[PDB]
Design a protein around this nucleic acid. Structure first.
Lengths: 203, 190, 174, 79, 108, 141, 196, 62, 42
RNA sequence: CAUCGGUUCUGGCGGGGGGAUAAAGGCCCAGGGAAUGUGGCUCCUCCGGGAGUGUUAUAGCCCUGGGUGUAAUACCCUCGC
RNA sequence: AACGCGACGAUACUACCCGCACGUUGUAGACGUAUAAGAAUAGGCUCCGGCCUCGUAUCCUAGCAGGCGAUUCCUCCGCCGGCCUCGAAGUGGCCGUCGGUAAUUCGCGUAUUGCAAUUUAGACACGCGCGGGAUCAAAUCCUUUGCAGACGACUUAGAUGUG
């Protein structure tokens, strides 16, 4: 348990409903949540079950006027996760609306969240939850086959971001090597009594 | 019932190289090199003996134990493909209109292309593109025969199936109209 | 069905002028406590010897403890259970360190695999298999195999449920 | 069928109070009718049910049969 | 100069009133203390004085900042949430707002 | 016919394998009951590492890299203790990295306010030395 | 798609500056006067920087083009301005092509050619408020029908208790945006040709 | 009748586009682009070669 | 080389063994002894 | 804030009793036995290990009786701080 | 989308920008509100030696809410300027100047807020003030138009002209 300014969550490898429940509880408790890479979220079960559920969703519309009052079918993966979250919050109240304003959802990782720490939720992670052999699908693939138009643009932007992250990781590895060398070199120059005092304290 | 341990063994010939990493099996031989991603199947690969690959499943059900036989046969087919190869001989027969088969190789894509003309007098030109790594030749020993050879059994058999299915007779009695291209022989190149 | 114990329950019919020394009857009852043990004992005597509770008495109730609870043993359980088709025999095998543990595992197993409750199951015999060759079921024959040793693939690590967020993705290799 | 691409009208699993009450009343009427038919039933029933016996895969069925022989012999000797 | 902090309290969040599914009771509030995740951890903070600090529009007696005072009474649930009783019930708008749990009265 | 295979090499539940329980104690596996429970015994002279003989669920334990060689199946506490002392399980466990992490955790948990203040001051002095070394290294290349 | 930058030419005509005004006769006509100075400030450094930004970051390049409405017999003096996409080539080719095309007249026969089908986009003839008979082509009711006959008899005769959006209603007819396709060009005639 | 969305009609149209209309459209495009090309041809910070900064939010205010 | 003919024509298929996941739990002689004991019991 | 009273929630510590005077278990004493057979011996090998034989040897286990022992501990009940 | 967004042009004032001067100005709620690999999970990481349950970690963390003067150190931080760089809703890197700075040790000050009472302290936005720098615009009514029109709305024209 910890209180943060905002929690940025990598949405890759997470289950939709469990992540939505945990995020909704955090929002109602008062924690600001940003979720990135919503196109990489996971739904348990085979893909045609999710496709059938979204087509059954697409069936429903206000009969006398589809421009007002009807279920507006948002095809984007971030919007699908937002719908899952909003179904778990009393959104028609002022408190629920205020809890919804504490949430941001995106496809990919737009800046400046690409240079921020992304956390994971182990209670929603698919490798930690699903039984081996059970099938699962991708919310981004579902979105692409129900009409989302920006799978390729997000993929190209993610490749560019990953190349820049690879360069940053090369610099980070160089810095880590230099830090280890610095500690090894300075270990001879620290006062010995300081050294065994810190060692006995556990540092 | 979950079975505590189950295992299978695949022998490897002397001139065959096998490399498995993250369930990506690469098999290289005299005829070439093949790859197959088996990451959708839970299996532990090991080298139980010199020239023998061991496949293990731990605490698996009957379905999971039975999948190892399919994995074994797939890897053995890759080994046979890179050692001896695979060859499908097809025959095209006709009653009145002679079927004209032209085989070319597309330089840009590197794949073979088969054009079929005069199938029961039709004016359309059927075009079927082979999978990469599959070579098609018009046979010289026998009459009206194509030969499809390669290292991938799946690619060779699927190319043969596409050629067989492109020449389908529609809205005619099949007891009377016997025209078409059929797989006449399956075997190894060597 | 619960933290069971084995009770030796001995009872009899009340002495009369015609029968001054009635016979004693002993059963082994797997029950959560002594009240349930005596109730099951009187139910079984009503089913078998037509001796009612009002015309009988309990002579003794004792607890039978396992002789070697630190020894791994194989148990064969012969039981009869009731479904809507009727009563059916069943022989099953359980690998435990005590008869009471074998009986609770049997109750959970019948509940899971045949939806049988406590009232519909009659425990007819619980025996400890003296030799390895007495083991019949393959799911115990694989466990009594020679030099048994297995790995544990795909172990989900224990993470506290109060720790919502983690900075690193976990691993399933230990 | 084209169920995935074009699903039909869903079948509701949400109950109605009227149907729940009607089903409960019909279940009570059916159990009372079964009690009446079992009372009026002329089908023959045995006094003693056919016991299934000892299972063959029980490893000590032979020793159980030995015990049954010994007990019957002892009872015949006592009587 | 110094560059450390000055915090001598523990952070908490005002979750809700004591409630059933439908009925709520503002006389008791639920507080989530930071780092407190079980009943044995929550037993340390029993009897501690908790302050809800908020702002107002008009300056009264030299300040615009008002405080509602209360105390932690008993643990709630199994996950370290505590029950708190204040002098006046906390505002219903402050569901999700922060509160300060003090280290006094101290028994250390 | 050369084969290159890269897969997972798990530690195995077997007789002689030492388990670390959630309370930090150790227990050698004497008999395997099933795939979820074993019979285990920790006959250690150190009370922190000792475990009474009994059933251990595998979900509550972790596999240490220590295996007592030639430990018989079903061996009682005296034989398990003799094998334990002959193999020197306590010393190898102390040399493992899990016990070092546990010792560091205990040392950090046992600190007081004055201890933490001294930790901060001595770490600042060592950090000054390390910062000089890092500046010298970065100025070199 | 998101517009990143626009680069304008140094000199804009009065008929295209009229597009940015509602009361051009009253205005000081100050539009683009400060923009025209940045061609001379720092040798057009800002112009070159924006052109390089389009070259390096963008994927779609469109020129801005306006009509010479003064050569028409129309009384309108304010010209029409639109984005015309450059297709073909690379992004640098498109940017250099547009920059070379700055302040230049483009004739119709260099964009289109005789014997080509094109698409025509326009707003249709306005008709005002029109009843259902001419707006939707409904059948007329019989003669002397009560409460009118140029109408639809039943608009909501079944459930729901609403008028549905698919039912013909009286309203605005014409003045609609339309995109008609596959129109063949029969002749591209030149203005200076006295026998076109 | 085969519809406008039929697979065989789409394949026939694709073959027509590739084999017949394509060269004609390419030649017309070459002529038109040649004519319009004929008309069209008829410090990094201080120079603008280095792209500097020009002269609702995605993040929470902090 | 293989001398027999395969029915479906996939001559590359290996000589498969029977699918017996419980193979090796009990020996043959113990099963013979159990056969004799079960026959006497019956 | 301290010292109290009433009601109540919760944590820890010192004792007593019961049962097969818990059952186990450790260490000794006296018997008996077997394999998922230790050591040894024999035969095969891919030299890694298999197969057979037989009762503790260069590991151990199981069953019975006895001693320490009114042992400890679990569980239940109970007197207090 | 009339309570989604972008680019661009011209912007008169009490309008715009810069420096500081504070708010009986406001905000679902600051108090260290610190921390970027990617990827797999029947496999990974690496400095290539080895390492991996574990963020129970790392950084930061002392001084009147943090002074003054030394001793001593060349470590860390901040603002500007130059060169590069960053377009997914655009911002970081290097160098240079200047200012500050216990890694060691010491002296002088702290009291009286009286035994606790938010520790009034942060960020963003808004407003009133000065002292400077920069700029002199449009829209509507009205007349007209008929590519339009129930009325509004819409396409036009009205400043010297191809009116």
């Amino acid at each position: 348990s910890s209180f943060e300014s905002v929690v940025v969550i990598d949405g890759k490898g997470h289950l939709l409903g469990r992540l939505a429940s945990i995020v909704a509880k955090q929002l109602l408790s008062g924690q600001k949540i940003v979720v990135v890479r919503c196109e990489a979220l996971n739904i348990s079960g085979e893909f045609f079950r999710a496709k059938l559920k979204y087509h059954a969703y697409l069936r429903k519309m206000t009969r006398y006027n589809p421009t007002r009052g009807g279920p507006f079918h948002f095809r984007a993966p971030s919007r699908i996760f937002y719908k899952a979250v909003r179904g778990m919050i009393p959104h028609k109240t002022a408190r629920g609306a205020a809890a919804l304003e504490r949430l941001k959802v995106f496809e990919g990782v737009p800046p400046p969240y690409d240079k921020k720490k992304k956390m994971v939720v182990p209670q929603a992670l698919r490798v930690l939850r699903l039984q081996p052999g059970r099938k699962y699908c991708t919310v981004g693939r579902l979105s692409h086959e129900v009409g989302w138009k920006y799978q390729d643009v997000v993929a190209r932007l993610e490749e560019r971001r990953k190349a820049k992250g690879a360069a940053y990781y090369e610099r980070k590895k160089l810095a880590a090597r230099q830090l280890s060398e610095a500690k090894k070199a300075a270990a001879a120059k620290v006062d010995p009594k300081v050294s065994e005092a810190l060692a006995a304290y556990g540092y | 019932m979950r079975y505590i341990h189950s295992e299978e063994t695949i022998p490897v010939p002397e001139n065959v190289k096998v490399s498995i990493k993250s369930r990506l099996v690469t098999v290289e031989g005299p005829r070439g090199k093949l790859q197959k991603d088996l990451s959708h199947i839970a299996v532990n690969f090991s080298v139980v003996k010199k020239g023998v690959i061991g496949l293990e499943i731990h605490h698996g059900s009957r379905k999971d134990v039975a999948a190892l036989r399919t994995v074994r046969t797939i890897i053995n087919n890759m080994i046979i493909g890179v050692t001896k190869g695979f060859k499908y001989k097809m025959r095209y027969v006709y009653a009145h209109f002679p079927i004209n088969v032209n085989v070319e190789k597309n330089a840009e894509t590197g794949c073979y292309e088969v054009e079929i003309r005069n199938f029961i007098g039709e004016k359309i030109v059927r075009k079927v593109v082979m999978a990469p790594g599959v070579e098609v030749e018009i046979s010289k020993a026998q009459k009206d025969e194509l030969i499809l050879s390669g290292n991938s059994l799946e690619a060779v058999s699927q190319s043969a199936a596409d050629i067989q299915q492109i020449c389908k007779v529609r809205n005619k009695d099949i007891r009377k109209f016997l025209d078409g291209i059929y797989v006449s022989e399956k075997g190894n190149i060597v | 069905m619960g933290r069971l114990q084995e009770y030796q329950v001995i009872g009899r019919h009340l002495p009369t002028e015609a029968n001054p020394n009635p016979a004693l009857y002993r059963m082994r009852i797997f029950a959560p406590n002594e009240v349930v043990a005596k109730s099951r004992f009187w139910y079984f005597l009503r089913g078998l010897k037509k001796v009612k509770k009002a015309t009988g008495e309990i002579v003794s109730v004792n607890v039978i403890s396992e002789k070697h609870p630190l020894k791994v043993k194989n148990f064969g359980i012969w039981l009869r259970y009731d479904s809507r088709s009727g009563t059916h025999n069943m022989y099953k095998e359980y690998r435990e360190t005590s008869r009471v543990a074998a009986v609770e595992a049997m109750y959970a197993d019948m509940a899971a695999r045949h939806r049988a409750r406590f009232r519909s199951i009659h425990i007819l015999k619980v025996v400890e298999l003296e030799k390895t060759e007495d083991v019949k079921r393959p799911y115990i024959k694989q466990l009594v195999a020679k030099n048994l040793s297995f790995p544990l693939p795909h172990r989900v690590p224990k993470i506290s449920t109060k720790k919502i967020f983690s900075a690193k993705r976990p691993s399933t290799f230990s | 069928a084209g169920t995935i691409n074009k699903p039909k009208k869903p079948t509701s699993k949400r109950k109605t109070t009227r149907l729940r009450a009607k089903i409960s009343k019909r279940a009570a009427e059916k159990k009372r009718k079964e009690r009446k038919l079992a009372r009026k039933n002329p089908e023959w029933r045995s006094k003693l049910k056919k016991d299934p016996g000892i299972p063959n895969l029980f490893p000590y069925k032979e020793r159980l049969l030995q015990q049954i022989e010994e007990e019957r012999i002892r009872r015949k000797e006592e009587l | 100069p110094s560059e450390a902090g000055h915090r001598l309290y523990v952070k908490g969040r005002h979750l809700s009133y004591q409630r059933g599914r439908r009925n709520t009771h503002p006389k008791t509030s639920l507080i989530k203390i930071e780092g407190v995740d079980d009943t044995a951890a929550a037993n340390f903070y029993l009897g501690k004085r908790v302050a809800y600090v908020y702002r107002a529009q008009k300056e009264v007696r030299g300040t615009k900042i008002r405080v509602i005072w209360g105390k932690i009474t008993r643990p709630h649930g199994n996950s370290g949430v505590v029950r708190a009783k204040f002098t006046h019930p906390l505002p219903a708008r402050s569901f999700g707002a922060s509160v300060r749990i003090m280290l006094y009265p101290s028994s250390i | 016919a050369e084969i290159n295979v890269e897969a997972t090499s798990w530690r195995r539940v077997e007789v002689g394998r030492v388990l670390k329980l959630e309370n930090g104690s150790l227990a050698a596996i004497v008999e395997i009951i099933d795939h979820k429970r074993v019979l285990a015994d920790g006959p250690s002279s150190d009370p922190k590492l000792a475990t009474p003989r009994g059933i251990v669920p595998l979900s509550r334990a972790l596999l240490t890299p220590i295996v007592i060689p030639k430990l018989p199946r079903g061996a009682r506490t005296g034989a398990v203790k003799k094998a334990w002392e002959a193999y020197g399980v306590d010393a190898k466990w102390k040399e493992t990295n899990w016990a070092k992490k546990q010792l560091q955790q205990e040392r950090r948990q046992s600190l007081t306010d004055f201890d933490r203040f001294k930790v901060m001051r001595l770490k600042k002095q060592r950090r000054f030395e390390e910062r000089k070394a890092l500046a010298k290294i970065k100025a070199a290349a | 798609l998101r517009s990143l930058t626009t680069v304008w030419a140094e000199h804009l005509s009065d008929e295209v500056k009229r597009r940015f005004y509602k009361n051009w006769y009253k205005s000081k006509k100050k539009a683009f006067t400060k923009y025209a100075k940045k061609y001379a400030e720092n040798n057009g450094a800002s112009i070159t920087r924006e052109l390089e930004r389009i070259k390096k970051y963008c994927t779609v390049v469109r020129v801005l083009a306006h009509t010479q409405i003064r050569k028409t017999p129309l009384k309108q003096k304010k010209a029409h301005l639109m984005e015309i996409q450059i297709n073909g080539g690379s992004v640098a080719d498109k940017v250099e092509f547009g920059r070379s095309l700055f302040e230049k007249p483009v004739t119709i026969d260099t964009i289109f050619e005789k014997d080509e089908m094109i698409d025509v986009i326009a707003v249709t003839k306005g008709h005002g408020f029109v009843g259902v008979t001419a707006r939707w082509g409904t059948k007329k009711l019989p003669r002397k029908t009560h409460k009118g006959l140029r109408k639809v008899a039943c608009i909501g005769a079944w459930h729901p208790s609403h008028v549905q959006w698919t039912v013909a209603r009286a309203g605005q007819m014409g003045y609609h945006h339309r995109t008609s396709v596959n129109h063949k060009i029969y002749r591209i005639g030149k203005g200076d040709d006295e026998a076109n | 009748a085969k519809s406008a969305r039929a697979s065989r009609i789409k394949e026939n149209h694709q073959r027509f586009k590739k084999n017949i209309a394509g060269p004609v459209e390419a030649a017309r495009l070459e002529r038109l682009s040649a004519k319009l090309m004929a008309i069209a041809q008829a410090s990094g910070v201080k120079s603008g070669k280095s792209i500097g900064r020009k002269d609702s939010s995605i993040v929470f205010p902090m | 080389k293989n001398l027999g003919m395969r029915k479906n024509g996939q001559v590359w298929l290996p000589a498969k063994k029977a699918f017996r996941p419980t193979k090796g739990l009990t020996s043959w002689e113990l099963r013979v002894k159990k056969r004799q004991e079960q026959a006497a019991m019956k």
